[PDB]
Amino acid sequence: MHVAYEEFEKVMVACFEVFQTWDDEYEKLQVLLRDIVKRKREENLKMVWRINPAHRKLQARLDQMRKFRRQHEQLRAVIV
Protein backbone atom coordinates (compact mmCIF):
# COMPACT_ATOMS: atom_id res chain seq x y z
CA MET A 1 0.00 0.00 0.00
CA HIS A 2 2.83 2.43 0.81
CA VAL A 3 5.39 1.69 -1.92
CA ALA A 4 5.49 3.65 -5.16
CA TYR A 5 3.38 2.76 -8.17
CA GLU A 6 6.37 1.56 -10.22
CA GLU A 7 7.88 -0.55 -7.46
CA PHE A 8 4.43 -2.11 -7.22
CA GLU A 9 4.55 -2.77 -10.97
CA LYS A 10 7.80 -4.68 -10.51
CA VAL A 11 6.56 -6.69 -7.51
CA MET A 12 3.30 -7.50 -9.32
CA VAL A 13 5.27 -8.66 -12.36
CA ALA A 14 7.34 -11.00 -10.20
CA CYS A 15 4.22 -12.43 -8.56
CA PHE A 16 2.60 -12.97 -11.96
CA GLU A 17 5.73 -14.78 -13.13
CA VAL A 18 5.41 -17.05 -10.08
CA PHE A 19 1.77 -17.84 -10.88
CA GLN A 20 2.53 -18.52 -14.55
CA THR A 21 5.41 -20.81 -13.59
CA TRP A 22 3.08 -22.76 -11.30
CA ASP A 23 0.56 -23.12 -14.12
CA ASP A 24 3.13 -24.29 -16.67
CA GLU A 25 4.83 -26.81 -14.40
CA TYR A 26 1.48 -28.13 -13.20
CA GLU A 27 0.42 -28.61 -16.82
CA LYS A 28 3.55 -30.68 -17.46
CA LEU A 29 2.81 -32.58 -14.25
CA GLN A 30 -0.74 -33.26 -15.43
CA VAL A 31 0.67 -34.66 -18.68
CA LEU A 32 2.83 -37.02 -16.64
CA LEU A 33 0.00 -38.10 -14.34
CA ARG A 34 -2.34 -38.67 -17.28
CA ASP A 35 0.27 -40.95 -18.84
CA ILE A 36 1.05 -42.88 -15.64
CA VAL A 37 -2.64 -43.44 -14.90
CA LYS A 38 -3.27 -44.51 -18.49
CA ARG A 39 -0.41 -47.02 -18.49
CA LYS A 40 -1.80 -48.48 -15.24
CA ARG A 41 -5.35 -48.14 -16.53
CA GLU A 42 -6.83 -50.98 -14.48
CA GLU A 43 -5.50 -49.43 -11.26
CA ASN A 44 -7.58 -46.22 -11.51
CA LEU A 45 -11.16 -46.52 -12.74
CA LYS A 46 -11.83 -42.79 -12.20
CA MET A 47 -9.14 -40.37 -13.41
CA VAL A 48 -10.59 -37.04 -12.23
CA TRP A 49 -8.32 -34.63 -10.35
CA ARG A 50 -10.40 -31.40 -9.98
CA ILE A 51 -7.35 -29.64 -8.43
CA ASN A 52 -8.50 -26.52 -6.53
CA PRO A 53 -5.18 -24.73 -5.88
CA ALA A 54 -5.41 -22.62 -2.75
CA HIS A 55 -3.64 -19.55 -4.16
CA ARG A 56 -6.26 -19.24 -6.92
CA LYS A 57 -8.19 -17.25 -4.32
CA LEU A 58 -5.07 -15.18 -3.70
CA GLN A 59 -4.35 -14.92 -7.43
CA ALA A 60 -7.82 -13.68 -8.37
CA ARG A 61 -7.85 -11.35 -5.36
CA LEU A 62 -4.46 -9.85 -6.23
CA ASP A 63 -5.54 -9.52 -9.87
CA GLN A 64 -8.55 -7.50 -8.74
CA MET A 65 -6.12 -5.55 -6.55
CA ARG A 66 -4.07 -4.77 -9.66
CA LYS A 67 -6.88 -3.59 -11.94
CA PHE A 68 -8.25 -1.42 -9.14
CA ARG A 69 -4.91 0.35 -8.67
CA ARG A 70 -4.19 0.79 -12.38
CA GLN A 71 -7.64 2.16 -13.19
CA HIS A 72 -7.58 4.35 -10.08
CA GLU A 73 -4.10 5.84 -10.46
CA GLN A 74 -4.84 6.54 -14.12
CA LEU A 75 -8.05 8.28 -13.03
CA ARG A 76 -6.31 10.35 -10.35
CA ALA A 77 -3.63 11.63 -12.71
CA VAL A 78 -6.14 12.37 -15.47
CA ILE A 79 -8.75 14.14 -13.33
CA VAL A 80 -6.14 16.49 -11.84
Binding site: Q30, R34, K46, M47, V48, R50
Partner: protein, 48 residues
Amino acid sequence: SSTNQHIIRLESLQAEIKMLSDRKRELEHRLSATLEENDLLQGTVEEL
Protein backbone atom coordinates in the same frame (compact mmCIF):
# COMPACT_ATOMS: atom_id res chain seq x y z
CA SER B 1 -2.92 -25.05 -26.96
CA SER B 2 -4.74 -27.79 -28.87
CA THR B 3 -3.91 -30.30 -26.12
CA ASN B 4 -4.93 -27.86 -23.37
CA GLN B 5 -8.27 -26.93 -24.93
CA HIS B 6 -8.83 -30.58 -25.77
CA ILE B 7 -7.94 -31.92 -22.32
CA ILE B 8 -10.05 -29.18 -20.70
CA ARG B 9 -12.95 -30.24 -22.93
CA LEU B 10 -12.22 -33.78 -21.77
CA GLU B 11 -12.10 -32.67 -18.16
CA SER B 12 -15.53 -31.19 -18.79
CA LEU B 13 -16.63 -34.48 -20.38
CA GLN B 14 -15.29 -36.61 -17.54
CA ALA B 15 -16.53 -34.24 -14.83
CA GLU B 16 -19.99 -34.36 -16.38
CA ILE B 17 -19.60 -38.14 -16.47
CA LYS B 18 -18.66 -38.15 -12.79
CA MET B 19 -21.63 -36.00 -11.81
CA LEU B 20 -23.94 -38.17 -13.86
CA SER B 21 -22.33 -41.35 -12.49
CA ASP B 22 -22.55 -40.11 -8.92
CA ARG B 23 -26.18 -39.56 -9.87
CA LYS B 24 -26.33 -43.10 -11.28
CA ARG B 25 -25.15 -44.34 -7.91
CA GLU B 26 -27.64 -42.08 -6.16
CA LEU B 27 -30.53 -43.21 -8.38
CA GLU B 28 -29.44 -46.84 -8.00
CA HIS B 29 -29.18 -46.36 -4.23
CA ARG B 30 -32.69 -44.91 -4.18
CA LEU B 31 -33.97 -47.63 -6.52
CA SER B 32 -32.47 -50.33 -4.31
CA ALA B 33 -33.94 -48.73 -1.19
CA THR B 34 -37.36 -48.31 -2.80
CA LEU B 35 -37.37 -51.85 -4.22
CA GLU B 36 -36.39 -53.27 -0.84
CA GLU B 37 -39.23 -51.21 0.61
CA ASN B 38 -41.60 -52.55 -2.04
CA ASP B 39 -40.62 -56.06 -1.02
CA LEU B 40 -41.38 -55.04 2.57
CA LEU B 41 -44.70 -53.58 1.40
CA GLN B 42 -45.59 -56.77 -0.44
CA GLY B 43 -44.84 -58.63 2.78
CA THR B 44 -47.09 -56.23 4.69
CA VAL B 45 -49.85 -56.67 2.11
CA GLU B 46 -49.52 -60.45 2.34
CA GLU B 47 -49.63 -60.35 6.14
CA LEU B 48 -52.61 -57.98 6.15
